RNA sequence: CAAGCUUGAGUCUCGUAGAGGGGGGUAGAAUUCCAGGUGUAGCGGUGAAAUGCGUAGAGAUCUGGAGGAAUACCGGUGGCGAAGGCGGCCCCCUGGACGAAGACUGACGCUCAGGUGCGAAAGCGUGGGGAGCAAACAGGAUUAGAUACCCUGGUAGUCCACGCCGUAAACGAUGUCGACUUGGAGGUUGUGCCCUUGAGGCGUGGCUUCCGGAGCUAACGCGUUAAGUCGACCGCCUGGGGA
């Protein structure tokens, strides 16, 4: 992606003054209006860095979780993950779904169960309130693991809209070795990101452009 | 009062690596410059300069390795209240000859390893690792 | 305290023009001064013992700077207390 | 620039039983608060102004 | 020399001496060698809330440069005069000659 | 507080102005702050307490 | 040891804020008291009462006067001081702090056992003063008792001068001085700049409140006003009771 090309989403715009991380520093270029501008001379080549090493690990096979729960932005991390043939977490992220991988599991066999069920077993003769009771249950599991539910293992890779807001599932990652990708903006706090992605993290225009250009490498990474 | 510069020196390279901060200065003073020397030739630090001559300000560059900081521990040993002394045969090694005590003796400011291989004892400042 | 013009006065008569203004001698006769003139103030107001206290850092002060100067210019100390009428 | 003989301005500070009115419902600064106030009471003394509804 | 702020306000039965006041008042502070800078008679004004039983009283104001020695006589001679029933002297870092309130408001 | 009715208001309107005005004054509250003898260091404490409440 | 050096420390100039100290004046609110006018059978007090006060006219109301003590509103995690502590207004005498600019002195500095001074309240001595409050004490109640808590009184004391005492949870339960180490929101008080063109816009000192980062910590928490990282000097601790 390009500086120009960058600017005009308004990756640039950051938050106020007030509610910045002093970490990081390095990545602002100043600030006017009492918000802080980050710097898009350090965002580039750090993101093109980010977008190798993604390149590098779906060519050999890997499998990425694009992570974003921000509600204005749940729809397009969903539809930039499935373009890529990977997975996604979309709405609120359960607390142990990588480190306690093996008892949220069961809840992906739940899942199947019941989607396969209400389509190939059908049922349709309910009791009348199991059909939305099933179904209940059903939709709830669907926002909470429809990205990953054909995940299989653990992920290889991390990629993160606002690395404060999804910081469970960053933490979760370091724990596991798992490399994380994030949008990291002026407020947050990048000590849990091995690539750093300094710029805003909630303009749909925003975060549109960098997971338009995150789901587009892999494809190539993966076309090989 | 200020009755110690070199401990300030100490602490001042101390405090700014544990600040990750790329420089640190300080008023100057040749014997500062001299344990800067050292430092510098055993590699704890990049380089320094003294900048000015009638207030001179004698600025050291830091130097870091893994995203941590080269200097480990870095501290006084004798002191204005309680100088320490020792001969050629009694010279401390610090971490068993990893780190360094530097020494000042009769032939300007040097490590334990040069004030021992030239037969000398001195006043021992400090230990750095 | 001292009046501008009477501290003006003294830096004249003790150092070495109008702008010797922080010599020893100056600054102990300016002490000198104010350490008389307040003299008469604790005549009549015993009570008033913060404002002493600050009296006493007059004189601890002159202290300190007597013997400095006596250390390094003996001679320049004598004249300075004769000239000033201190020590009986 | 407060002077207790104005007495027209001195009066927008207090109520209408003479009582001086707080910094927080006039939103003045607090350094002239007090000038104010060292007006309202010199004028006092001098009759320029009431201390009390009573009178 | 310091500047003063002097207010009296003399009981109004006696307003005819306070020419004389002033005339007097004037001549112990321009004999002093100080400067007299602003002097408004204002005369009977209304007063505030009710003084030994008086409403309204004869008001003096004066604006003044003068020594210590000169400003005690004044403190006292008020006290000393029974005509005065008020006054107050206050202290000025600067010289004033601008008409008061008082002269404007009228 | 003193009020004074004004013509063709109701005696009703004239007394919640009335009441609207002390309790503008704070007459019972400061009646009720001096009905009893409180320690310096007893108001001094009072003051930090509702200094500290009055942060939200 | 000798000569220095100017950044530490002082001195000088002009200003700023302040319940900093001491003395002297003075003000309006209220209580109690004294003297009267109107008025008449209660007032007062409590959980309920009673003691108490009132037909020698209380209480209530209006008026005049005496006296003492404290200074509503302003008033505020406001301000000042080494600490204790300091609050109506005015003057006089006086200490400290801070800012701006440049000149002067030239390490004159930091700490401090012993020493000296200061030091809330209560208490002590002499003489004043004495409205309110109130140890003691008396009376009324409560209670199984009630040497209390509550009520009606009330002496020392609380106030002034001059002496004494030298203690407090005298506390930030955190000794003093200096250097260094990410941030956010405020309060207070200097000062440089900007069509002052708005009650502002951009800086730069002093003090201060609330959060919080690393680090520290047994934890609680502290966190550039450190309980972090260092140095100089002092004071103190060494199981509980006994003490
Ligand atoms: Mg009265
Ligand atoms: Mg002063
Ligand atoms: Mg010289
Ligand atoms: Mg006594
Ligand atoms: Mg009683
Ligand atoms: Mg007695
Ligand atoms: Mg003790
Ligand atoms: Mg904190
Ligand atoms: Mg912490
Ligand atoms: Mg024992
Ligand atoms: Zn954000």
Same mark, same amino acid.
């Given at each position: 992606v390009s500086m120009r090309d960058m600017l005009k989403a308004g990756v640039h715009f950051g938050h106020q003054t007030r509610y910045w991380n002093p970490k990081m520093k390095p990545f602002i270029f100043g600030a006017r209006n009492k918000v802080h501008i980050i710097n898009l001379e350090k965002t580039v080549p750090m993101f093109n860095e980010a977008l190798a090493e993604l390149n590098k690990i779906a060519s050999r096979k890997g499998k990425i979780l694009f992570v974003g729960t921000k509600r204005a932005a749940s729809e397009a991390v969903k539809d930039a993950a499935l373009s890529c043939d990977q997975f996604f977490v979309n709405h609120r992220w359960l607390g142990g779904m990588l480190t306690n991988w093996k008892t949220v599991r069961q809840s992906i066999k739940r899942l199947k169960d019941l989607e396969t069920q209400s389509q $190939?077993? *059908?049922? $349709? !003769?309910? *009791? !009348?309130k199991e059909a939305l009771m099933r179904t209940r249950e059903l939709e709830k599991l669907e926002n909470s693991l429809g990205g990953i539910k054909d995940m299989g293992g653990l992920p290889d890779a991390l990629f993160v809209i606002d690395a404060d807001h999804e910081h469970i599932a960053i933490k979760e990652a370091n724990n596991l070795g798992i490399p994380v990708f994030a949008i990291v903006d002026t407020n947050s706090d990048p000590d849990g990101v091995d690539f750093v992605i300094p710029g805003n993290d909630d303009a749909i225009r925003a975060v549109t452009l960098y997971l338009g250009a995150v789901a587009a490498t892999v494809r190539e990474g993966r076309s090989q | 009062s200020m009755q110690d510069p070199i401990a300030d020196m100490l602490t001042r390279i101390r405090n700014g690596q544990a600040a990750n901060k790329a420089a640190v200065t300080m008023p100057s003073s040749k014997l500062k410059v001299a344990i800067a020397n050292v430092l510098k030739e055993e590699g704890f630090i990049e380089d320094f300069k003294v900048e000015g001559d009638t207030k001179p300000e004698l600025e050291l560059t830091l130097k870091y390795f893994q995203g941590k900081a080269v200097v480990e521990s870095i501290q006084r040993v004798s002191r204005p209240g309680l100088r320490i002394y020792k001969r050629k045969d009694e010279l401390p090694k610090v971490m068993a000859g990893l780190g360094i005590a530097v020494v000042s003796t009769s032939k300007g400011v040097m490590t334990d390893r040069a004030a021992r291989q030239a037969g000398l004892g001195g006043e021992i400042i400090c230990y750095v690792a | 305290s001292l009046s501008t013009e009477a501290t003006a006065k003294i830096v004249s008569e003790f150092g070495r023009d109008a702008n010797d203004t922080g010599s020893t001698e100056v600054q102990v006769a300016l002490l000198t001064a104010q350490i008389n003139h307040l003299q008469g103030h604790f005549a009549e107001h015993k009570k008033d013992h913060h404002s002493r206290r600050g009296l006493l850092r007059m004189v601890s002060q002159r202290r300190k700077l007597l013997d400095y100067l006596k250390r390094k210019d003996v001679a320049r100390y004598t004249q300075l207390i004769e000239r000033l009428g201190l020590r009986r | 620039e407060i002077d207790y003989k104005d007495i027209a301005t001195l009066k927008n500070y207090i109520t209408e039983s003479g009582k001086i009115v707080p910094?927080?419902? &006039?939103? &003045?600064r607090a350094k002239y608060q007090r000038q104010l106030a060292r007006a309202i009471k010199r004028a006092r003394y001098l009759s320029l102004l009431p201390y009390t509804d009573r009178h | 020399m310091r500047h003063y702020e002097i207010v009296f306000m003399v009981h109004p039965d006696q307003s005819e001496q306070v020419p004389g006041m002033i005339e007097r008042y004037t001549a112990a502070i321009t004999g002093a060698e100080g400067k007299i800078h602003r002097l408004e008679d204002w005369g009977r004004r209304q007063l505030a809330y009710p003084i030994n039983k008086l409403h309204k009283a004869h008001y003096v104001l004066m604006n003044v440069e003068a020594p210590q020695e000169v400003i005690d006589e004044l403190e006292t001679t008020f006290r000393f005069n029974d005509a005065v029933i008020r006054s107050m002297v206050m202290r000025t870092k600067h010289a004033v000659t601008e008409a008061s309130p008082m002269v404007k408001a009228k | 507080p003193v009020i004074k009715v004004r013509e063709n208001e109701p005696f009703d309107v004239a007394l919640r102005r009335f009441k609207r005005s002390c309790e503008k004054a704070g007459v019972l509250a400061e009646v009720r702050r001096r009905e009893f003898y409180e320690k310096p260091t007893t108001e001094r404490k009072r003051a930090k307490a509702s200094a500290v409440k009055r942060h939200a």
């Open positions: $190939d077993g *059908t049922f $349709d !003769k309910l *009791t !009348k | - | - | 910094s927080r419902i &006039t939103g &003045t | - | -």
